[PDB]
């Protein structure tokens, strides 16, 4: 019962595509994965192996434009029944032509092809040739190739076109076609030659005026052609509703912005309304009855109409305990009762390498996963911003940063065979705005006077990166909440102070001053309470040797002999110094699983017409997606790289630090405002950046990437 090919589905990790032909799944040939008839519906099952050996199922069903009404319903029916066959532990997606999700687009790096025809017209994927097709290649990072009529009417000056003739495959790009867009058109022309034609096809690329005689026979003379036509901040707001059942009825449960994990009741299903951005999630509760769970895919279509969203809205239904990290970031502190529920398919190929200082200079991957460009024991110079000039910090005070000051640290990192530099700009949260802006102005000039190659990294008091903690050898990075270290104003310390001693991957600690309240404690870290009478050394149950050894060295600065005290075993005088015992933070940290819960995503952005638009590039993070004439954002959880190309617009280069700020402000997860941003330039990327790019070639930009493939593939 209901097992035609379900047996073969989801048995091994990989990609599986079927075509719904007459209410039946017809497998698509492996060499033709990516071709999609505009008149049919498909069902795609991506099997990914979790870290714990189990399998993870991403169920996509794709709807063609010229697809019949019952063709799409048959695809949605198979998706509900395939998920039912796979124990319901699958994420289902409603993908439409030209508006599919990033998870689906990641499965096709060569690019999609939208072929004319379908089941009703009498067409099928076969390898029998003699053809005469023409594709329009649109998109810069998400490259789509829609079949168009074979005529100059379908051409334009802005895009590249591929005229298929069988024994010859002519590629043609207009006068206004961007060079990076021509590179993506070559991927499609190669995917046609090597896969569809089985390598027996001569590709002849050409441009305006230099078109061959073969093009002149099937198209004719070339007349005057027209030009091309080619997120904003709507991704900030989202809402959550509860569905009940006659007809359908939704009721608002979530106010706005982020929500709570407790509102998700297991007995019912919910809708994560984000249609303003273009996607709606449907959350199947574990106690939700069977009628509602199987009709959950239809509940989204009704909600699309009930709210008047476009038909091509992305839909993703998911079960309880199998939520995607995209969905989980809409919630305040998500907790699951190696690996987690979901595993992002684009980081599933990345091999996890734990930190080891002895081999850090060898593994670029280890540098990315921990943010350590090197061990942090290189030549460094530190300045303090007094007014409008840099003041060298006393070498004895190296490691002490006051909240009322702004600093500039120029560090020389060594890693692998190459050598580089990083410029840290530590903006204290209590520093005056004129000096804070001056620190950033001096940080930028220091870069341009150093050749424009070093790295810029704006860091705010509290959220210091992992690499910045380790710059002081064995000494911990001490952060004072206020005051200043200039000769003039020598501020006195507070009567009672509290220091949180956090440790990073490399075991280096940082002591950030916080408010002397019991709620500021954290069981994972060691804490120091400097009261006038005594001197405590709170060792959290989760604190290791690194936090303890770094906490007592902080007392060496305060000239107070510590009284080490255990968690939950503190004498009464400890609570009297804070202000009464309170419920602190006992929950542990993610550590190794923080990369899974928040996978690194790559975006392209543009601040044109006073509107900040961001386009996420799907699939595995590859070097070829970094466009030289663009400014890219790599969003790690602790850090936000901003890769700026060499051939980008002049305003885009300067408006790069603000571009990442706009990206963090508009993030629906309500990211920390103090999240550090790192400015990285093309050709001088630090190891913590290239470690996410497997197969990173150093001399990649030594030869033009277009001129490479224009001869490498032709």
From Swiss-Prot:
Tissue specificity note: Phagocytic cells, platelets, fibroblasts, nonmuscle cells, smooth and skeletal muscle cells.
Q: Where is the composition biased (Basic and acidic residues)?
A: 192-207
SMART domains in the cross-refs: GEL
**Positions annotated to bind Ca(2+) 5:** 404-405, 435, 484
Segments carrying the region annotation (Actin-actin interfilament contact point) are 70-73
Q: Where does Ca(2+) 4 bind?
A: 267-268, 292
Positions annotated to bind Ca(2+) 1: 39-40, 71, 119
Pfam families in the record, alphabetically? Answer: Gelsolin (PF00626)
Q: Positions of the Gelsolin-like repeats?
A: 23-105, 143-215, 255-327, 388-469, 509-575, 614-689
Segments for region (Disordered)? 192-230
Q: Residue positions of the PTM Phosphotyrosine?
A: 33, 342, 398, 536, 584
| Cellular component, GO, one term | actin cytoskeleton
Task: From the record, give the cysteines joined by S-S bonds.
Answer: 160-173
Which positions bear N6-acetyllysine?
517
Q: Which residues bind Ca(2+) 6?
A: 447, 452, 454
Family according to the record:
Belongs to the villin/gelsolin family.
**Entries under PANTHER family matching the protein:** GELSOLIN, VILLIN
- The name this protein carries in UniProt is Gelsolin
């Amino acid at each position: 019962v209901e097992h035609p090919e379900f047996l073969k589905a989801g048995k091994e990790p990989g990609l599986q595509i079927w075509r719904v032909e007459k209410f039946d799944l017809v497998p698509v040939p492996t060499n033709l994965y990516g071709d999609f008839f505009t008149g049919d519906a498909y069902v795609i099952l991506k099997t990914v192996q979790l870290r714990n050996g189990n399998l993870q199922y991403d169920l996509h069903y794709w709807l063609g434009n010229e697809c019949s009404q019952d063709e799409s319903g048959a695809a949605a029916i198979f998706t509900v029944q395939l998920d039912d066959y796979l124990n319901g532990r699958a994420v289902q997606h409603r993908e439409v032509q030209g508006f599919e999700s990033a998870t689906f687009l990641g499965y096709f790096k060569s690019g999609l092809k939208y072929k004319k025809g379908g089941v009703a017209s009498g067409f099928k994927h076969v390898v029998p040739v003699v053809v005469q097709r023409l594709f329009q290649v649109k998109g810069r990072r998400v490259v789509r190739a829609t079949e168009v009529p074979v005529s100059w009417e379908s051409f334009n000056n802005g895009n590249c076109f591929i005229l298929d003739l069988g024994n010859n495959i002519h590629q043609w790009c207009g006068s206004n076609s961007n060079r990076y867009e021509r590179l993506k058109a070559t991927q499609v022309s190669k995917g046609i030659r090597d896969n569809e034609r089985s390598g027996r096809a001569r590709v002849h690329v050409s441009e305006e005026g230099t078109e061959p005689e073969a093009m002149l026979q099937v198209l004719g003379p070339k007349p005057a052609l027209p030009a091309g036509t080619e997120d904003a901040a709507n991704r900030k707001l989202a809402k959550l509703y509860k569905v009940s059942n006659g007809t359908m009825s939704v009721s608002l449960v979530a106010d706005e912005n982020p929500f709570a994990q407790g509102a998700l009741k297991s007995e019912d299903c919910f809708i994560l309304d984000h249609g303003k951005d273009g996607k709606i999630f449907v959350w199947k509760g574990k106690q939700a009855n069977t009628e509602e769970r199987k009709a959950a895919l239809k509940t989204a279509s009704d909600f699309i109409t009930k709210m008047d969203y476009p038909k091509q809205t992305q839909v993703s239904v998911l079960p309880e305990g199998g939520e995607t990290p995209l969905f989980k970031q809409f919630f305040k502190n998500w907790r699951d009762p190696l690996g987690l529920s979901y595993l992002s398919s684009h980081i599933a190929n990345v091999e996890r390498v734990p930190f080891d200082a002895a081999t850090l200079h060898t593994s670029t991957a280890m540098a990315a996963q921990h943010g350590m460009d090197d061990d942090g024991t290189g030549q460094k110079q530190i300045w303090r911003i007094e007014g409008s000039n840099k003041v060298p910090v006393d070498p004895a005070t190296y490691g002490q940063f006051y909240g009322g000051d702004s600093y500039i640290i120029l560090y020389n990192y060594r890693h692998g065979g190459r050598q580089g530099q990083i410029i840290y700009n530590w903006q204290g949260a209590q520093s005056t705005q004129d000096e804070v802006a001056a620190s950033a102005i001096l940080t930028a000039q220091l870069d341009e006077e150093l050749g424009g190659t070093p790295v810029q990294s704006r860091v705010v008091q509290g959220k210091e990166p992992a690499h910045l903690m380790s710059l002081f050898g064995g000494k911990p990075m001490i952060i004072y909440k206020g005051g200043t270290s200039r000769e003039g104003g020598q501020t006195a310390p507070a009567s009672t102070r509290l220091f949180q001693v956090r440790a990073n991957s490399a075991g280096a600690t940082r002591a950030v001053e916080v408010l002397p309240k019991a709620g500021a404690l954290n069981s994972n870290d060691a804490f120091v309470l400097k009261t006038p009478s005594a001197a405590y050394l709170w060792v959290g149950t989760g604190a290791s040797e690194a936090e303890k050894t770094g906490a007592q060295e902080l007392l060496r600065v305060l000239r107070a002999q510590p009284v080490q005290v255990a968690e939950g075993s503190e004498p009464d005088g400890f609570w009297e110094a804070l202000g009464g015992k309170a419920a602190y933070r006992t929950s542990p940290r993610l550590k190794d699983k923080k990369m899974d819960a928040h996978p690194p995503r790559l975006f392209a952005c543009s601040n044109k017409i006073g509107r900040f638009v961001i386009e996420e590039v799907p699939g595995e993070l590859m070097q070829e997606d970094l466009a030289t004439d663009d400014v890219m954002l790599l969003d790690t959880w602790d850090q936000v790289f901003v890769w700026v190309g060499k051939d980008s617009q002049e305003e885009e280069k300067t408006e790069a630090l603000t571009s990442a700020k706009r990206y963090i402000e508009t993030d629906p997860a309500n990211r920390d405002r103090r999240t550090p941003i790192t400015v990285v330039k093309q050709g001088f990327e630090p190891p913590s950046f290239v470690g996410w790019f497997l197969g990173w070639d150093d001399d990649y930009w030594s030869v033009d990437p277009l001129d490479r493939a224009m001869a490498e593939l032709a």
